[PDB]
Write a protein that binds this ligand. Structure first.
Ligand SMILES: COc1ccc(S(=O)(=O)n2cc(CCC(=O)O)c3cc(OC)ccc32)cc1
Length: 266
C-alpha cells in the first residue's frame, strides 16, 4: 500500500517515454511565454494553405477532396498516430503485456478514443488546439466553420476539455488516469476479466494515493475523475455514431482501416 508509489512512477515513466507531447510542454506553448516561438495560427482557408505550404507541415494523406475533408484527414492521421503511442504506452505496463494479445486488442479497441479525448484536453484551450507537434494552432472558430458533418466532430471534445482542464491535472496524474482507462474490466469480450479487474483496481488505488500527495487541498478529485471516465465513455459512443454517419453520407471521404476496425462491432 506504499509501493503504489512505485507502480505510479513506473506508469509516469511509461507515459514520458511514449507520448510525443506532454501537457507540460503543451501548456508552456499555449501560454506563449517559455518557448519564444509562437505556433502558426490557422483560422481560415488562406492560413491553412500557408500552413501546408511549409510554415507548419501532404503527410501521406489520402487524395485531396476539399477543405473540410482535408482537415478531417489531418485529424484522422493524428488520431491513428496517437493510437500507436497508446499501444506502446500500454505495452510498457508489465501487467498489460502479460495479457494475451487478444485481450490487449480488446482493451485498446475500446479504450483508445476515451484516452485520446482525455489527452486532447492537454493541447486545447477554449479558443483552439495545438497541431503539428506544437508548431501550429487551429482555432475552434475555424473548425466550426467547416462543412457539416465535419464541423460537428470536435466541438463536444472542446466542451469536455474545458471542464476537464479546470481540474488542473498534471502529466503524472494523467499517466495514471490513462492507464485506468486502458485497463478496464468492463470491455465487451474480454477473456481474462478477473486479471484485468485486478490490474484496474491497483491502478485506481494508486491514483487516489497519488492525488492525495499531489493535490492535497483538492476535495473530491478522485470521485470527479471517475465521473469523467464515464463522461468519456459517452463521448466515444457519440463519436462512433458521428463516424457511422460520415461513413454512410460522406462516401468520398477515406476512412482509415484501423479506426474502421475499432468502430466495427462497437
Ligand atoms: C488534430 O488532433 C486531433 C486528434 C483527435 C481528434 S478527435 O476529436 O478524436 N477526432 C477524430 C477524427 C477522425 C478519426 C476518428 O474516427 O477518430 C476527427 C475528425 C475531425 O474533422 C475535423 C475532427 C476531429 C476528429 C481531433 C484532433
Amino acid at each position: 500500500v506504499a509501493d503504489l508509489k512505485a507502480f505510479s512512477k513506473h506508469i509516469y515513466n511509461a507515459y514520458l517515454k511514449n507520448f510525443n507531447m506532454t501537457k507540460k510542454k503543451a501548456r508552456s506553448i499555449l501560454t506563449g511565454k517559455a518557448s519564444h516561438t509562437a505556433p502558426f495560427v490557422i483560422h481560415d482557408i488562406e492560413t491553412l494553405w500557408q500552413a501546408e505550404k511549409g510554415l507548419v507541415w501532404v503527410n501521406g494523406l489520402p487524395p485531396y477532396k476539399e477543405i473540410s475533408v482535408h482537415v478531417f484527414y489531418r485529424c484522422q492521421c493524428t488520431t491513428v498516430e496517437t493510437v500507436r503511442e497508446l499501444t506502446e504506452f500500454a505495452k510498457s505496463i508489465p501487467s498489460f503485456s502479460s495479457l494475451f494479445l487478444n485481450d490487449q486488442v480488446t482493451l485498446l479497441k475500446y479504450g483508445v478514443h476515451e484516452a485520446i479525448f482525455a489527452m486532447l484536453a492537454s493541447i486545447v484551450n477554449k479558443d483552439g488546439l495545438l497541431v503539428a507537434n506544437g508548431s501550429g494552432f487551429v482555432t475552434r472558430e475555424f473548425l466550426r466553420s467547416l462543412r457539416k458533418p465535419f464541423s460537428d466532430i470536435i466541438e463536444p471534445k472542446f466542451e469536455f476539455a474545458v471542464k476537464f482542464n479546470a481540474l488542473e491535472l498534471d502529466d503524472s496524474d494523467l499517466a495514471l488516469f490513462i492507464a485506468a482507462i486502458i485497463l478496464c474490466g468492463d470491455r465487451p469480450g474480454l477473456m481474462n476479466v478477473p486479471r484485468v479487474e485486478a490490474i484496474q483496481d491497483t491502478i485506481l488505488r494508486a491514483l487516489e494515493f497519488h492525488l492525495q500527495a499531489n493535490h492535497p487541498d483538492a476535495q473530491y478529485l478522485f470521485p470527479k475523475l471517475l465521473q469523467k471516465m464515464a463522461d468519456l465513455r459517452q463521448l466515444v459512443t457519440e463519436h462512433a455514431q458521428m463516424m457511422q454517419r460520415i461513413k454512410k453520407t460522406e462516401t468520398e471521404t477515406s476512412l482509415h482501416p484501423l479506426l474502421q476496425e475499432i468502430y466495427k462491432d462497437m
